[PDB]
């Protein structure tokens, strides 16, 4: 009666085998799901307020090293001299600074002026750039209320207002300067629910932070996540300190592996990016900027001292990042080095990529950096690299660098296949995916590396042009409404279809009290209306 044994098992478990193989694929994706980028925001000296502005600036080889600001109450004359040994003096007086640090919109988030002035500029600027990045992702910030998304950030303390204190703004300084309050406040104002974490690994603090987010996004405690870092300095005490060891470049320009590599240069930086799982982002219809394949973080540990890193740790972290990403040195073709410009770290990094990349290369890999274009931005500097590569990968063009006289002699460039990317080059699609490497070596000892892959191929879709269409805009203030209207007018001066931009502004924006609507059927019609629109009603409902 048990003769039913021959045919049965095959049909019985033809599904069991594929089920259990699918489970294996599930473990593979769980440990190694590529993560997706959908949001973007950056703020850098030289007037950089949008990522495309930065990309264009790098494209035109424009330096951004500025002069030391004086609005912070600095006794500049007491710090500038040719005496590098004089107490409390810096042999450098030129450096990139974000001059818009003091500017802020307190009313947008409903912030009283007393706490606003008492509040650390880092936090307000965090909130602004976070909102900008979230909008850039085309996601309604209001809809994020009650969601499980989390926030991760990286920043070190700076003691803004740590000196003389007035007896009026008391009660806000502790919340003003505490680092965790940054993420706490951004989540509170956004009404989120995911984990809120602030970290610190010196200049690498951004790069590690987003890496952490990846784990969370892989683990499943949040749908999307926010990452990035900001560094703005209120006291020049760093420069003079480094001026005591003469680590800075007297001209304030970091020569990335150049012949004249003789110092470093500091700058302020702002960067925020939205991270999301590839499958979830694909389902949600959000556009894909670029995909991460893996990450690695490790501490150098023992070394010749405390500040000097060991190249073997760099080799280990590069290999670990490549293995976790499942990539090989052949596939990648461009790596964003740290580009500190120090006479010590630069040769070590150079031979590190020599030993880890300059092998069995059928094509000579290209090396570039951004610090020759702007400088070092401390914690933000790391994430700054991610800002430009994704733009460079977007435009299919390799951006050049600056101050390239000839490569520093401390590197046997014959050993590897690397060469410095001193000239802008085309980086087009060819059917083979394009990959870019990012790295950061914090002075605290920890080092991090990131791997980026180009976004997949998405077919363009053609749509009919509607005869007539409304254009709507909402904001919290009338002047903000006018500025927005002028901005869409300026954008409309370019070549865009009216229907698509109308759909975008109606589907990728929130709704605010200040409202304005203009009906138009032609680009000229809408431009004229926007530049002439002056009647707006912030009414109350009945």
């Amino acid at each position: 009666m048990a003769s039913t044994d021959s045919e049965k098992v095959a049909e019985y478990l033809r599904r069991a085998t594929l089920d259990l193989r699918a489970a294996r694929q599930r473990i593979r994706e769980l440990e190694g799901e590529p993560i997706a980028i959908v949001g973007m925001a950056c703020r850098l000296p030289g007037g950089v307020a949008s990522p495309e502005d930065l990309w264009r600036l790098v494209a035109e080889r424009v330096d951004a090293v500025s002069e030391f600001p004086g609005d912070r109450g600095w006794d500049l004359d007491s710090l500038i001299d040719p005496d590098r040994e004089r107490a409390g003096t810096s042999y450098v007086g030129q450096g990139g600074f974000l001059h818009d640090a003091g500017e802020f919109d307190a009313g947008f988030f409903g912030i009283s002026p007393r706490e606003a002035v008492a509040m650390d500029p880092q936090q307000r600027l965090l909130l602004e750039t976070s909102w900008e990045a979230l909008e850039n992702a085309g996601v309604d910030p209001i809809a994020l209320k009650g969601t499980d998304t989390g926030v991760f950030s990286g920043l070190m303390g700076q003691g803004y207002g740590s000196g003389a204190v007035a007896p009026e703004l008391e009660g806000f300084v502790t919340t003003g300067v505490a680092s965790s309050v940054a993420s706490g406040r951004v989540s509170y104002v956004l009404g989120l629910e995911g984990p809120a974490v602030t970290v610190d690994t010196a200049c690498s603090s951004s790069l590690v932070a987003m890496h952490l987010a990846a784990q969370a996004l892989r683990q499943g405690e949040c749908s999307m996540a926010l990452a990035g870092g900001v560094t703005v300095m209120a006291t020049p005490g760093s420069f003079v300190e480094f001026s005591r060891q003469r680590a800075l470049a007297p001209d304030g320009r970091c020569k990335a592996f150049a012949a004249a590599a003789d110092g470093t240069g500091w700058s302020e930086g702002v960067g925020v990016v939205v991270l999301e799982r590839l499958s979830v982002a694909r389902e949600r219809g959000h556009r894909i900027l670029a995909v991460l394949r893996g990450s690695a973080v490790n501490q150098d540990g023992a070394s010749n001292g405390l500040t000097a890193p060991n190249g073997l740790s760099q080799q280990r972290v590069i290999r670990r990042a490549l293995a976790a990403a499942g990539l090989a040195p052949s596939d990648v073709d461009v790596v964003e080095a740290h580009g500190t410009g120090t006479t010590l770290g630069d040769p070590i990094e150079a031979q590190a990529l020599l030993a880890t990349y300059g092998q069995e290369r059928k094509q000579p890999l290209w090396l570039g950096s951004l610090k020759s274009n702007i400088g070092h931005a401390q914690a933000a500097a790391g994430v700054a690299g991610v800002i430009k590569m994704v733009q460079a990968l977007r435009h299919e063009t390799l951006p050049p660098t600056l101050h390239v006289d000839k490569p520093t002699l401390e590197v046997d460039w014959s050993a590897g296949a690397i060469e410095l990317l001193t000239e802008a080059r085309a980086w087009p699609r060819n059917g083979r995916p394009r990959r870019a490497g990012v790295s950061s070596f914090g002075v605290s000892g920890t080092n991090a590396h990131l791997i980026l892959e180009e976004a997949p191929a998405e077919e363009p879709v053609a749509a009919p042009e509607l005869p007539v269409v409304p254009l709507v805009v909402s904001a919290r203030s009338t002047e903000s409404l006018s500025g927005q209207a002028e901005r869409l007018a300026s954008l409309l001066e370019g070549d865009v279809s009216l229907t698509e931009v109308a759909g975008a502004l109606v589907s990728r924006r929130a709704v605010l009290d200040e409202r304005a609507v203009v009906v138009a059927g032609s680009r000229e019609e809408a431009v004229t209306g926007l530049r002439a629109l002056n009647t707006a009603g912030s009414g109350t409902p009945g």
């Epitope: 009666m1 048990a2 044994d5 045919e7 049965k8 049909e11 599904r15």
Partner: antibody, heavy 118, light 114 residues
Framework: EVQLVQSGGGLVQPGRSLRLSCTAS????????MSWVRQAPGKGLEWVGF??????????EYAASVKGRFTISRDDSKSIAYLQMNSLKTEDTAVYYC?????????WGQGTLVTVSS | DVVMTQSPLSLPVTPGEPASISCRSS???????????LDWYLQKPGQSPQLLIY???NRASGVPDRFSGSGSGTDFTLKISRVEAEDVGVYYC??????????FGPGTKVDIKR
């Protein structure tokens, strides 16, 4: 993905014929053995029939009760199985399901109801 | 001659705690190859049937991991750990040693406990 669609059910007066067709997608339909099972309303499920694949000759086997009126056939070109009511009766009113796998049933369609009345 | 499989007729249960449903047989289900030809099917109220467990040991895809099963000889048991609201339905511990099968038996219904 492995997806099943069922169609052909409906209300027909007693003593007629009907065709119910179930189409498969996302996998090799011809490599499995289809089956059909009906469930009476307010009652349990009842096995009806099953047809093997070409590897085993694609023989069709039916319960004795349903013998003589119902036939099951499969088309690999369209990956669709047809089951044929004949001499339809009221007592045969049931919701019918097409499943993949001869003995084990790993999948079910949306299910179709059969109404028989005058 | 035909093996007869039985089980508790109904097991009303509250959510949040594990439950267990047994299933007996009139013959040993082990084969010379060394496998217990017993499967478990679940039908939701007014929905298609669903397959959860085959060979009483390993679980199919899609099924929540809170499900499990075990047994040997002619005795077997399906164990749930977290009773849920949608977990109510009709279960069938149906054998495959003898083919074909005419029906699935009465089955075991599960309802919330009050």
């Amino acid at each position: 993905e492995v997806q099943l669609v069922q169609s052909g059910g409906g209300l027909v007066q007693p003593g007629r014929s009907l065709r119910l067709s179930c189409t498969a997608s996302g996998f090799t339909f011809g490599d499995y053995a289809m089956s059909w099972v009906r469930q009476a309303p307010g009652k349990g499920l009842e096995w009806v029939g099953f047809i093997r694949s070409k590897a085993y000759g694609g023989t069709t086997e039916y319960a004795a009760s349903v013998k003589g009126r119902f036939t099951i056939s499969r088309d690999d070109s369209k990956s669709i199985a047809y089951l044929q009511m004949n001499s339809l009766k009221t007592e045969d009113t049931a919701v019918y399901y097409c499943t993949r796998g001869g003995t084990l049933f790993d999948y079910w369609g949306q299910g179709t109801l059969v109404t028989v009345s005058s | 001659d035909v093996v007869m499989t039985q089980s508790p007729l109904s097991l009303p249960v509250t959510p949040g705690e594990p439950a267990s449903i047994s299933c007996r047989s009139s013959q040993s289900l082990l084969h010379s190859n060394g496998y217990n030809y017993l499967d478990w099917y679940l039908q939701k109220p007014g929905q298609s049937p669903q397959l959860l467990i085959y060979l009483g040991s390993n679980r199919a895809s899609g099924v929540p991991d809170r499900f499990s099963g075990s047994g040997s000889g002619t005795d077997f048991t399906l164990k749930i750990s977290r009773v849920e609201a949608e977990d109510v339905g009709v279960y069938y511990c149906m054998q495959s040693l003898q083919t074909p099968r005419l029906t699935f038996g009465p089955g075991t219904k599960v309802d919330i406990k009050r």
